[PDB]
Structures are given as structure tokens and as C-alpha cells.
Design a protein around this ligand. Structure first.
Ligand SMILES: Nc1ccn([C@@H]2O[C@H](COP(=O)(O)OP(=O)(O)O)[C@@H](O)[C@H]2O)c(=O)n1
Ligand SMILES: Nc1ccn([C@@H]2O[C@H](COP(=O)(O)OP(=O)(O)O)[C@@H](O)[C@H]2O)c(=O)n1
Ligand SMILES: Nc1ccn([C@@H]2O[C@H](COP(=O)(O)OP(=O)(O)O)[C@@H](O)[C@H]2O)c(=O)n1
Lengths: 236, 267, 267, 236, 267, 236
């Protein structure tokens, strides 16, 4: 009662609708690359350093950079103030964002270095890991790191037995499945795929396809955020 | 190693795997339940040389304030340093954390352990279930080893009968034991992508060379309670499709081994 | 760097700073309150390229046994690794800890958040206020960035009306929100000593070359609620005097920007 | 009431009796050496690595390997689920197992290396530190590490004023003394000796001697576990 | 160092020790009780240049659910980095942990602090005793330094008289103080084995060269409440026998110094 | 009610009076330098090591030693037993003592080294950070580390609207301001200045000046503690 109806959703959107997504690239002075993303009520900042001198010097891979990802929510990002620090959730989300960004990066280009990706969720309303990946990509492109593709991400989910796109916190919390997908769109390569909840095969595949149509949209926004940047530089 | 990537890809191209398994074959499985007799439940699972003990210890506690209506289930994977030279002492690392969470979700989201049947006094006193997963020897596909041992340990579990004495308000743990409310048997099935080939139950050697991994967790009902693409790499939609399907079949085969191990232990 | 110390000292001797600021000038300030809409209050402050978000989240809890008469205020600075290549993940380091404590004292000791007006049931249920400071981009003078954003976030805060139902003993959080009891607007003002010159609002470049730093926190009343000489170096008594005075003037100028940002957000 | 009587013990054993001890060597693929031990209701696994490259490179001794021991109980090993991780108990037991294994090892044979010993108590019923040492030895022999001797261990204790061998959890918990002893039997060298509880000199010495007769038995089992292994290798 | 092992062994063979102590000699002992006047009890012990402060702080708390019948005693050794260049900041390392536990057992297992006489309301409110051992200067035989200072601090302790007001149910801490129920005076005595010679109270120099160490803790009653062979090395049964005996004699000699220090502090 | 009156203070001192300060230098064998200080009911020990080999070798500054300060209170130092370990307070006090000692040290004299300063508060009654600094200085001089000056420290404060010198725990706890000051007296260089509480400019400056008159006294005591040492060495 009643995340769908009729046939609109709680915020009034249709079931294949995305929340208002804003994205800005290059928002931070210190980071080598940064992006900010407002995706619905999410407000998430991604920074990249560098490729940089890796320490400790034993972590280094001799033939390639390593990707390190840290995803973190500010204490004020959630309804119930999250104590500062790492938790199992953020650690798994970090592992799973890394495994999403990695394939897009030509890591052998910078042996013995780390590419450090930070995702800060300043406000969260479901879909942070995919909003985060979507910003990490931009922040990576922003860092001038060559990539095979942007990684775009978006979740699909089930609410009221119905497959919807792009869950909000209500829908994720009270829904039947959360299906985040990150793809590199050009080659249709899924670099993140998670399913939390309970679906049949057909419901899972349809949610995976829906989230990919969602991530393809996000991608256009992503390119359009790079375009916008690669137009600001067009000065003078 | 890395010399080994080449051998493994090349073998793959000839339909072969280093141990003459087919791409859809698990290594020999051994499941043995009730091996930690002081635990409420337990399971030693071997996937080939991969070994994991899971132990179910239960106590009575407060439910979480959010859910006065459900018992507690908490899943921890210890990647004990003895199990692998890549396992270091300390708090769970991300491998351990992602394995714990994915197995838990598998079980949790299939309502495989029905938490609603683990209430004793609503909002006050529930059954708290600890799935503690002791990885003994890491030789690949720990995800499946652990989800198999977790669910088998849960099925094996026999917890003390509790009754609320409605007349004192006392809660009496009794000497009679009962099963946990285990209502489904989620089994993760996991595939490594190596080049353009997915291979079920990757051994360590294949994990070292794999591009990515995907785990599909399914129950008897035809439902998926978890999917986790882990590590790097990418999958095509239709590799997922294949994996979801194959997973369902591999699951049913394991599920039988799990149930046969569970039933053997009552013998 | 260190090449840079020389340029900065030399410039200083000519009344100049690297960005043509005067010695008493702040970089451009941007204060924006209520930017984290799910928080009770929040403030994005930019001191030049230095950026800090502060978020006020409030809950109801027990007061400390010592003070049944006061609500709780707790201040944490996260120096998030994204903010600076000198920020590493982990528990607060001493930079973070000293910034948290100095800002807190500033606010606490001016009774800027009147904790005595945050009691609901004395000795049992108070308003607990979390000032969580998320440093986004460290480009100098984080002390001021944070104290400005903390106080502005507090002024911006709108917390749920609570009432003790004297007849049940229940505490009712209501949909109507109210301000926090923010009664003063402490603003730290901070100076770097570089050679024999104090320069307000040191940028990162000036922090790298500075000898010491001193922070004076003052409210509208003409009172100082905190002083912190931080880092090394030494000050002459009369540099302190100058700083205390200048701080008071810089404070009043910021205070206006804070109040204008706070009022804009009700628009 | 009544850990002795009459004159049998709770599990029906006499007071100089050992619990059923099983021991298998070479149970783990990854470890360089491993042993499993069932000693009564104890189920304990020991692994050794290697001699191995020691890190960090400053830990290295220039003339010898270092022994590092980690003793750990699984959360399900005890009646009241032990939260995962180190505690003072396990840390002292680790220190005291190390100091038991050390003298048996010819450490100068492998300078700049670590010999890492792990003891995992999978189920515990008193006597884990001595069962553990007894398995660590086997796991060490299993690792092909030259030793001056096996270290064998066994506890003696006092229950009902009476010196007994090889306490179970009941006896250790409700008894008057726990006296674990580890010896290298061949030369009669006590490499672990602890006393917890309250004894006179005569009661302590008699418990120390009893635990050594116990550890000499354990030792035969230990040799017989090596024999058994050095017979499986006899293939073809 | 290591040059030093040779000198020490060679000296040992001539009945000599580097500081002309006999093998059964302690270095000069200084015990001074009540030196931390804000603590309930305290003891500065010097074994030669080895210095340890122990502080007894007591509060009232819940007993452990297992033991509603006993007060609480908890023993912590801080090996403060100032005390030795081998002491690093952090959580107790194993040296600290083994020293704490061995001293505690010494005291605990002799019922030296009678926990059963530290109950105020059974199952609800007991005296909780913190033995906090601050090692100030590590120059050998910290085990004995600490057990001596722990027990002497306990004897020195004067804790607030508590009474259950049977009529309100209130617990009244009173201004009158009383002793703790200290009923025995366990003293660890510790020997280093260097070659085939055991030497009491090893200094740092002897610890650096020793093969192993054994600590026998005994009270006035002729009972041993702890034995700990620590470090590596091996002992012959009859070295233990010797040590147990010698320990008993060394103990009685120390015990006198402890009691004389305890009595001096009431002067 | 009533930390002043009339016009004496709780312990009977006047408002510009110091508590009985004792100071001894060279109290520890292991430290390179040590000092003990009894300041009222404070009992604080400072040790220095060395200049010493800095680890890890990346911490090293190539042109100078680094100062590291650790301030710590024993669990028995305070009225309510402080759990062992670091807390925000001690960490800030450590940062602020470092920043007080640093300017007095000719750090470039010993490149690539650390000068490690430990302050242990064995008993505390307000004024530990300034008593601590005062002892750290002596312990530094004791270590034979060249210094431009001793750093002397003392707090002034407000109680009952009145500026007093050298707060005790009562006065600090129930007073209106705590103003610790550390100066190197010879050149009048304030190396620590903190204000906790609530003062006007005039009250703050007067407390800063008062605490400096206090720290100048402490300094004479400091010299007189060095003198005393540089007379014990005058043997034979
Ligand atoms: N500790 C947490 C975890 C999740 N959540 C909320 O629930 C949402 C969904 O959680 P999730 O685990 O599905 O992660 P995302 O969907 O954000 O990637 C988060 O965005 C948060 O809004 C929260 O408030 N606090
Ligand atoms: N945390 C603990 C400590 C001891 N114990 C039990 O008490 C037994 C004896 O403890 P101990 O400290 O004497 O160690 P061992 O005798 O195992 O070497 C252990 O084997 C456990 O069965 C436990 O259940 N939980
Ligand atoms: N955790 C704490 C903090 C302060 N205090 C007391 O209050 C005094 C003043 O605290 P402070 O923060 O002003 O530090 P100091 O004045 O010691 O430098 C300390 O010396 C202690 O006596 C305490 O007992 N426990």
C-alpha cells in the first residue's frame, strides 16, 4: 500500500521513469577528477586521484595501475544518522563499484600506480551505488584517465509485483527486489549486476533489461556532462 | 602463475578445464552436517579442496526495534589466515564481507530461515541465529562452498524449544530441541568468466585467471534470492541469462546433496 | 613547494599575498544552508576553494548522567580522503579531532546552542544534536570553513516538535518543526603567522608555508568562546591582541553572510 | 558435586585417563603443513606456513626464522558463541603456544623468514591449548620443518581435591587447578607450563608430572600420526 | 647486545651476574603505596630500575550474570611507550596481555581479593575493582614488579563504605572508607633460565640473553596461585621444582617489604 | 559558590598564586630524557626518545627531525577511571603540546629522525597539558637536545567573574574559562595558547598575561631543575 497507483508511483512517476538526474563534472580542486550527481534525492560526489604513486610500494602491480574505490555515506545522508566510518554495506558497495569501474579502465597504461576513487553520498534515497558509479565514471573521464567506455549504472526493481525502473528509498525499502546494473553501454558489457530480493528468472531478466535501458539514458546524460565540460574548456 | 592464465584460456578453447571438469561441472562435493556437535547446527562443505565449516549458534535476544515481529539472523564469514596465504588476520576484509552479505541475502531474501517463526515474545524476545562461517581451505568458489554449508547447517540446526510461560512471564529454554523454520534451500551457483566462456565452480587456479564472476542464488521454488557479479570483468546480458538458468540446474543438483547430507545426520 | 615558501614570504614583505588578498581579507565566501534536505539542518560553506558541508541530524536520547538538565551536542569532522591527498581513510586523525573540538567549544562555550532548551523530560529524554562536518575540498582554513558551516547549519536547523504527553508519559514527535535554540553565532577567525605577519584565512599554499596559526572564535556579544593556537610557531602577546581584535571584525562580516544565507533559505 | 565418583569421572573415565584422541596429519591443501586433532570434544586444526618471505621486511631476524602463532576459536566452538576476533585469552594462549613450539624448531635454518602457525579451535572442551600445540607440532613436522623433537602437550588438573589428568570443560570450569604442560619428550624439556587455580607445591609438582605422563602418551599418538603419513607417501 | 649474551653466560659460569647479584637475589626493591592519592589505592614498585605504578580505582557496577555473588576485578597492564623503546602505542600487545592475565590469576585464584565480600546487592550491585598497571620504566622482571605493585596497591586500597539502605533501596556511598577484602598476598617470583642456570629477577640485560622464564606466584599459605613459563626455552621438571621452592622463599621476603610499605602508608 | 573567598581560593591560595610545584629531571633509565612534575595534585612524567631512527622510513623529513608527542592519562589519574587508550581530548592535547615544543627545538639539527615525547599524567587536577609541556621541556633538555629556550606553561582562568592563575580541577570544572599558555620566556614567544570558556577581549588578554607571569615563574623552577641536575653531574 501503495508504491504503484494509478499507474503512477509515489512521486508521481510512471514505472519506466527516471528521477530528475543532474550531473556536473570537475567540482573539486584537489581531486584529479570530480563529478557531482543529483539523482532524485541522492546527492553524491565522486573524486579521483590520480594515477598516483602507490603506497605501500608492495601493493604495486608491475604491469598496471590498481583501482581502489571507497564508497562512504555522510552521517547526515540517511534518515537515521549513520555513525561515521566503514560498514559491511559500504565495504561491499565499494568492492562492487570497483569491479564496475575496473573493466572500463585501461589499467596497464599506468603501471605501479593506484587510481583512487572516492564516492561520497551526501544524501541518499536509494540508488547511491549506481548514481555513484555514474559519477565515478565522469570523475574518471574528468581525471583524463583513458577509458574504454563510461560505465553507466541504474537500478531496476520490483514493487507491487511490478517491475519498475530506478527505485526511491520507499520503493527499495518496501519493494520486492533491487536490481542495480552498471554497464559500459557501447559494447553492452555489464560490469555490475546485483539482485537483492526475490524474483523469478523472467522478472530478474526483465529488471536487468529495464535497468540497462535506464543506464543507457544515464549514459547520454554522462556524455552530455562531458560535452558540457569539453565546451567550458573551449575558452578562449 | 600468469603463465597459468595462458594454459587455462588455451585449454578452455578446447572445451577443457585443467582438471577435466566440463564447464558446467562442480568439483566433487562433500557435505557433512552436525560435525560441530556443540553448535546448534553445522556443516562441513568441501567443493573439491575448498573447505568451509559453518556453525549455527542460536541464542535469545531482543529483535531490532524496526522488526519486533522477526527473529535475528546474522552471517559472518571468517577467512581464517590458515585457509589461504591470501587470508590475513583481522576484521573481515571486503572478500569476507561480500561473501557474508551475499550468502545472507540469499537466505534472508528467500525467507529460507523464516524469521517470523522465530519470535517468542513479540518485540521483546526472539531467536537470534548466528551463521558463522569458518573458511578452512580456500581453493576456489568460496561463495558456493559457504552458501551450501550455511543452508545445510541451518537445515541441520536443532535449537532448544523455548516457551513463554504466559503465567510468570518467564521464558523457559527446554531440553527438547526443534528445527529452525527453514523453509527453502537457497544454493548459490557461481560462474567465472574466462575470456568468453563461463565455467561453473571456478577453482583457485581459475579464479586467478578469470575476468569476472557471477553468482546466482536460487531456491526450489524457481526463485532467485541473490545475484552478485563480483570482481571485475563484464558479462553480456545473455551470459547472465545462461548463468541464471544453469545456476537453477546446478542448484537442484546440489540441493539434493544438501538434503541427503541433512537426512544422513539424523541416522 | 618550499620554493613556494620563499615566494610567499617575499610577497608578504610587499604587502601582497599570492591571490592579491589583503592580510585581513577572506577569500570569496559562499554559504548555502539547507542543501541536505533530509538533514535537520545543513550548510555548504566555501572559503575560496575550501568546501565544507555540515549536517545537523537530531534525535532524542538520554542526557549524560552528569547533566540531566541539558540536551546533547556532538561535533565530528570527517576529513574525507576525497577532500585532500593528505586526508587518509580512518578514525579522525588529530587534525580532524582538533578541528571538531575547537568548533564545538566555540559553539558550546558561547551557549550558542542552548542545550538547556533541548530538554524534553529532565534526566531522561533530551534533544541530541549531531554536527557532522563533511570536509569536501581542503584548500586552507578549514577551521573557519567548518565553524561557519557548523553555526550556519545550526541556524538552519529545523527539528521536529516534541511534546511530552504528560498524561501517558509518551513522547510525541510531531510533523511541525521548530528551530534549534541557537542564541549566538560564534565564528572562528583564523590567522596564519608567516614570518612576522599574520594573514587572515590562510589558503592551503599559505598553510604550507606558515609558522603557526591562531583561531579566535567570537560571537555578536563581544565575547570569545574559543582560542586555539594550532600547529607550531610562536605568537607575541600583541599578535594575539591584534588577532583577537581583527577576529572580532572579521566575525561580524562573516556573521552577516551567515545570517543572510540562513534567511535566504526560508525564502 | 561430583566431578569424581566412584572413582570414575563425569564421562566415566578414571583419573589418569585420557579422552579419545584422534590425529590426522596433512588435512589442508593451502597450508605447508596441517594436522587435525580430535581430543575428546575438542576439534582443532593446525596449519603451518612456510618458512616464508617475512613481511614486513623489518621483522626479519638476520640469523633465523621467527615463529608466529595464532590461536583462535571459531564462534561456534564454545557453548556461548564467541564473537569473532582476538581476545586476551587467545592472545596469551598464542604467546604461550609459540613459546612451546619455539624451542623445538631449528630456527637458524631459515634466516629472514617466518614460520606461521595457526591453531583453529573448531570445538573446545578444555585442553585446546595443549591439543593445539600437539597438532601444531604435527603440522610443523608435516611442513617438513626440522625439529629437535615433537612438542607434546596435555593438561593435568585438580578436581575434588584430587589430581586428575586431562580436564574436560566441566572439570576445568568447576575444578581447582588447570595445569597444561608441553614438553619435548625425548629430552624431557618442558616448553609450556601453566597453572591456573590453587595448589600446594606437592599438588602442583604431581599435576606437572601427571600431565607429562599424559603428554608422553600423546606423543606416541603423534609419532603414530607421522608414521601413518610416512606410510601413505610410501606410494607406489 | 648479543656480544652481551656471551658475557652474561660466561659470568654465569663463575657464579656471577653482571651486577654482582647472587642467582637468588632480587635487585633493590622499593615499594611505595598510596602515591596516587586520588586513587583508591596505589603502589609504586621499583625492582632495581624497573618501575611500575599500579592504581586501584573502584566503582559500583553489576556483577557478571554468571556470578551475582562476587564483585568484579579487572587487571590491565599498560606498557606505556615511555617505559621502553620496545613499548609501542596501542591496545595491549601480548606482553601486556600475558602480564595482566598472569597477575590477575595470581590474585584471583588465591582469592587474594575476596570478590564474595564485594557484593552490595547480590546479582545487581557489586564493587568493581580496576587494577591498572602503569609500567613506567622497563628494566626487567616486569611480572614481579607488577604483581608486587598490584597486591601492594590492593592492600593499600581504601574504598568508600557502601550501604544498601534496605528501606529506600538506595545505595549510599559514604565518606568513611574501608579496606578491600584482601586476604592473601600473592607475589610472583620469576626466574630467567640462561643456559642451565635459573636466576631470580632477571634484569633487562638478562632477559635479552635468557632462554626462557618461569614465574611462580605463591601466597603466605604455602599455595601457588599461578605458574607461567613465558617466552621460549624449556625447563626440566626439577628446575620447576627448584623454582617453585625458591619462589616461595623469595615471596616471603618480598611479602614483608609489601606489608612494611602498606603499614608505613597509614603512618 | 564559592571558588573565590575571601579573597582566598578553595585550597586557600590567593588568586595569583601557584599550587606547590615540584620538578625533578632524569627520573627514567630508558628514556633519553625524563622529568617528573608534581604541580598541585598533578603528577606527570615526561620522557623523550631520542633523536632516533624514524620509522617508517617515509615519515622522515630530509632536512630535520620530526617532533612526536603523546599525552596520555593513566586510568587512575582522574576521579572517574579513564578507560585506557587515546581519546579526542588527549589527541588534541598531544597536538597542542607538540605545537608548543616544536618551536623551541632546533629540528634541522637531526634530519631524518623523530624526537618522541611522551607525557604521562599519573594524577590530574587541571593544568596537566601545561604541567606536561613544562616537564616535556625539562625532559628535552635532559635528553641533551638543543633548544632555543625552555618552553614553560601555566594556565590562567576565570572563576566567579575573577581572573585567577593556575586552576585546580574544581576551578577548571566549575569556572568560566581555562586559558593555558606556553611560552618560551626568553623571547616571550607564545607557543601554546588556548581558551576554553567565555571571556571578553580584556578578560582574555588579562588571563593570557597572568598565565604568562605564571609560566615565567614555572620557568625559574625549570632552570632550577636543570641547575640541580647540572650540579649532580658535577661528580666527582
Ligand atoms: N544504512 C543505510 C542503508 C541504506 N539506506 C537507504 O536505503 C537505500 C537503498 O540501500 P541499498 O543497500 O539498496 O543501496 P543503494 O540502493 O543506495 O545503492 C539507500 O540509498 C539509503 O537511502 C539507509 O538510509 N541507510
Ligand atoms: N571464552 C572461553 C574460554 C574458555 N572456554 C572453555 O573452557 C575451556 C578451558 O579454558 P582454558 O582457558 O583453561 O583453555 P584450554 O583449557 O582450552 O587450553 C576451553 O576449552 C573452553 O571449552 C570457553 O568456552 N569459552
Ligand atoms: N577525562 C577527563 C578530562 C578532564 N579531567 C579533569 O579536568 C582537568 C582539566 O581538563 P582540561 O581539558 O582543562 O585539561 P588540563 O587542564 O589538565 O590541561 C583535568 O586535569 C582533569 O583533572 C578529568 O578528570 N577527566
Amino acid at each position: 500500500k501503495l508504491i504503484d497507483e494509478n499507474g503512477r508511483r509515489i512521486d508521481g512517476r510512471k514505472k519506466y521513469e527516471l528521477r530528475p538526474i543532474k550531473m556536473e563534472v570537475g567540482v573539486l580542486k584537489n581531486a584529479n577528477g570530480s563529478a557531482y550527481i543529483e539523482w532524485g534525492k541522492n546527492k553524491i560526489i565522486a573524486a579521483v586521484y590520480g594515477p598516483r604513486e602507490l603506497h605501500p610500494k608492495h601493493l604495486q602491480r608491475p604491469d598496471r595501475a590498481i583501482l581502489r574505490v571507497r564508497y562512504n555515506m555522510a552521517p547526515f545522508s540517511v534518515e537515521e544518522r549513520k555513525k561515521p566510518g566503514p560498514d559491511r554495506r559500504s565495504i561491499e558497495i565499494s568492492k562492487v563499484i570497483k569491479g564496475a569501474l575496473e573493466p572500463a579502465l585501461i589499467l596497464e597504461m599506468f603501471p605501479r600506480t593506484a587510481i583512487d576513487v572516492f564516492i561520497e553520498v551526501l544524501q541518499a534515497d536509494a540508488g547511491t551505488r549506481v548514481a555513484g558509479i555514474t559519477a565515478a565514471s565522469l570523475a574518471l573521464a574528468d581525471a583524463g584517465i583513458p577509458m574504454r567506455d563510461l560505465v553507466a549504472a541504474c537500478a531496476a526493481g520490483k514493487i507491487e509485483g511490478e517491475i519498475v525502473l530506478d527505485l526511491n528509498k520507499e520503493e527499495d525499502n518496501y519493494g520486492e527486489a533491487d536490481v542495480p546494473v552498471a554497464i559500459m553501454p557501447l559494447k553492452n558489457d555489464i560490469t555490475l549486476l546485483q539482485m537483492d530480493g526475490y524474483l523469478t528468472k523472467d522478472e530478474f531478466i526483465e529488471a536487468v533489461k529495464l535497468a540497462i535501458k535506464g543506464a543507457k539514458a544515464v549514459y547520454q546524460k554522462q556524455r552530455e556532462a562531458l560535452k558540457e565540460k569539453y565546451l567550458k574548456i573551449a575558452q578562449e | 602463475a600468469g603463465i597459468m592464465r595462458d594454459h587455462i584460456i588455451n585449454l578452455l578453447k578446447e572445451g577443457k578445464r585443467i582438471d577435466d571438469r566440463g564447464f558446467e561441472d562442480y568439483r566433487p562435493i562433500e557435505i557433512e552436517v552436525g560435525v560441530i556437535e556443540k553448535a546448534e547446527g553445522s556443516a562441513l562443505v568441501k567443493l573439491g579442496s575448498t573447505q568451509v565449516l559453518v556453525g549455527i549458534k542460536t541464542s535469545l535476544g531482543e529483535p531490532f526495534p524496526d522488526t519486533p515481529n522477526m527473529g535475528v539472523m546474522t552471517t559472518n564469514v571468517e577467512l581464517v589466515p590458515l585457509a589461504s596465504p591470501t587470508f590475513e588476520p583481522g576484521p573481515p576484509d571486503e572478500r569476507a564481507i561480500e561473501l557474508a552479505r551475499v550468502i545472507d541475502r540469499g537466505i534472508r531474501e528467500s525467507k529460507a530461515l523464516n524469521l517470523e517463526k522465530m519470535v517468542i515474545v513479540p518485540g521483546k524476545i526472539v531467536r537470534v541465529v548466528f551463521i558463522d562461517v569458518h573458511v578452512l581451505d580456500h581453493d576456489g568458489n568460496l561463495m558456493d562452498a559457504i552458501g551450501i554449508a550455511a543452508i545445510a547447517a541451518l537445515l541441520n540446526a536443532r535449537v532448544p524449544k523455548v516457551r513463554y510461560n504466559e503465567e510468570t512471564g518467564e521464558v523457559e529454554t527446554l531440553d527438547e530441541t526443534e528445527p529452525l523454520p527453514v523453509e527453502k534451500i537457497p544454493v548459490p551457483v557461481t560462474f567465472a568468466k574466462i575470456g568468453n566462456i563461463l565455467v561453473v565452480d571456478p577453482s583457485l587456479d581459475e579464479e586467478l585467471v578469470m575476468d569476472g564472476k557471477i553468482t546466482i542464488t536460487t531456491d526450489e521454488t524457481g526463485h532467485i534470492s541473490a545475484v552478485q557479479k563480483s570482481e571485475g570483468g563484464a558479462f553480456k546480458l545473455e551470459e547472465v541469462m545462461y548463468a541464471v538458468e544453469t545456476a537453477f540446474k546446478k542448484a537442484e543438483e546440489i540441493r539434493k546433496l544438501i538434503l541427503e547430507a541433512v537426512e544422513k545426520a539424523k541416522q
